[PDB]
């Protein structure tokens, strides 16, 4: 309930967790969903070293600016993305919450900057801008204007004017082992039948059975003298199974 004003967009770091994206693209509440070089269902399939999440408030017409190869007041002055941005964008409408009867001036957005932001560059400076011949140098007056602008989120406007909430996420390169992944399947076990199995990564075919072998707490699967898999530990109930090749 504390969404960031776009001029000072906040950033969230997510790592070492199960990233369940199934609800996100299944939920219809998100008016807009976009992935650049990525697919929604594939996100659960994929794993990343580390991922970030940015959030800011903008009205409907400004939501169109959040994308690679796009420009505008928001895109250039407040929050800029690169053209090779390998991430996704999620936005939804927040008119009732964000809009105030006299306009929601609690939220601010940048109107002026001496140069456009570089990708992911952040700036909250408030120096009075020189809008004319006068070297204002931080003094208000004629042609000396406050660089930030307060949001006029009045309820009595159309969809284009009404505020929106935006979330932008991206993932890092594979410089190290991944730490965030989609949820994995956990199917029911079978015994005394020939089945295909994939326990963690161990993949094989054979008939299964619980046996008397006593694994140590840390050991996951057994091995034979000839280096063929000979037993497995069930990762749900941690019971020790035994594997025999299909006849």
């Amino acid at each position: 309930t504390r969404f960031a004003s776009v001029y000072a967009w906040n950033r969230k770091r997510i790592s070492n967790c199960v990233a369940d994206y199934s609800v996100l693209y299944n939920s219809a509440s998100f008016s807009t969903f976009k992935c650049y070089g990525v697919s929604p269902t594939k996100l659960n399939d994929l794993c990343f070293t580390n991922v970030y999440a940015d959030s800011f408030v903008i009205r409907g017409d400004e939501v169109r600016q959040i994308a690679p190869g796009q420009t505008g007041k928001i895109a250039d002055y407040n929050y800029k993305l690169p053209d090779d941005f390998t991430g996704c964008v999620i936005a939804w409408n927040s008119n009732n919450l964000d809009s105030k009867v006299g306009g929601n001036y609690n939220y601010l957005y940048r109107l002026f900057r001496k140069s456009n932001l570089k990708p992911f560059e952040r700036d909250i400076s408030t120096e009075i801008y020189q809008a004319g011949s006068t070297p204002c140098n931080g003094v208000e007056g004629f042609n000396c204007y406050f660089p930030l602008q307060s949001y006029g989120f009045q309820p009595t406007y159309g969809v284009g004017y009404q505020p929106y909430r935006v979330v932008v996420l991206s993932f890092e390169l594979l410089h190290a082992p991944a730490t965030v992944c989609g949820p994995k399947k956990s199917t029911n076990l079978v015994k005394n039948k020939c089945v295909n199995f994939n326990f963690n990564g161990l993949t094989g075919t054979g008939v299964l059975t619980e046996s008397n072998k006593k694994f140590l707490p840390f050991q996951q699967f057994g091995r034979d003298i000839d280096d063929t898999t000979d037993a497995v530990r069930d990762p749900q109930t941690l019971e020790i199974l035994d594997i025999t090749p299909c006849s």
Partner: antibody, heavy 120, light 111 residues
């Protein structure tokens, strides 16, 4: 639950000044706009002017415009209504309401109200 | 006040479904989808259980539904019960940035 209590109902001659107030509790009063509503016996609901979350802007209906003024205190979580040019018809029960997470333009929470009496 | 127009009265047996309409000028109703509805009970202040024409706040029955059409918006009360017997009012926001209440509508559930 969010609660609103109206106070300041009084007996006054017509035209003479009068004050209505109501205090809020249980939520961020400063975050949301505030409203006033008045009802006559055996009749419907009538709307009264509005004040913004920070009090910087106001909007009035002609029946109360000029006659009544609305102000707020965000530290005491309280609302005020300053009244003048009253009439006998102005005798009614007044409620105040506020917006919430549902919407700043909603009259979500209501108090029990208070009574105003005007006669010569 | 310049109240919105509503039908005078309606009646139905328990378990039936009835709808109440709320109408006004284009600026009052048609301009935006912020219509809301209120319910009052004897010796109590009014209560609001509608927003954005159709949405249901918390602490509200599942029997309330609403829709908008042209310069008119309507509230439908399914599963009529004795508790529903009351006078109902609608509110909408005008382009003047002022809120307007309806004239009222009285519903009877034949318990």
């Amino acid at each position: 639950q969010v609660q609103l209590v109206e106070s300041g109902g009084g007996v006054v001659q017509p035209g003479r000044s009068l004050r209505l107030s109501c205090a809020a509790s249980g939520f961020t009063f400063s975050n949301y706009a505030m409203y006033w509503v008045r009802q006559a016996p055996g009749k419907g609901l009538e709307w009264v002017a509005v004040i913004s979350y920070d009090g910087s802007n106001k909007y009035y209906a002609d029946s109360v415009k000029g006659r009544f003024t609305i102000s707020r205190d965000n530290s005491k979580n309280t609302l005020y209504l300053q009244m003048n040019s009253l009439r006998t018809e102005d005798t009614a029960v007044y409620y105040c309401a506020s917006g919430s997470d549902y919407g700043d333009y909603l009259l979500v929470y209501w108090g029990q109200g208070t009574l105003v009496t005007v006669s010569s | 006040q310049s109240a919105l127009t509503q039908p005078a009265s309606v009646s139905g047996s328990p378990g039936q479904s009835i709808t109440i309409s709320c109408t006004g000028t284009s600026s009052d109703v048609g301009g935006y989808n912020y219509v809301s509805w209120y319910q009052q009970h004897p010796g109590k202040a009014p209560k609001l259980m509608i927003y954005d024409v159709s949405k249901r706040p918390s602490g509200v029955s599942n029997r309330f539904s609403g829709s908008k059409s042209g310069n008119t918006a309507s509230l439908t009360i399914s599963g009529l019960q004795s508790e529903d017997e009351a006078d109902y009012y609608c509110n909408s926001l005008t382009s003047i940035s002022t809120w307007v209440f309806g004239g009222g509508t009285k519903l009877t559930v034949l318990g």
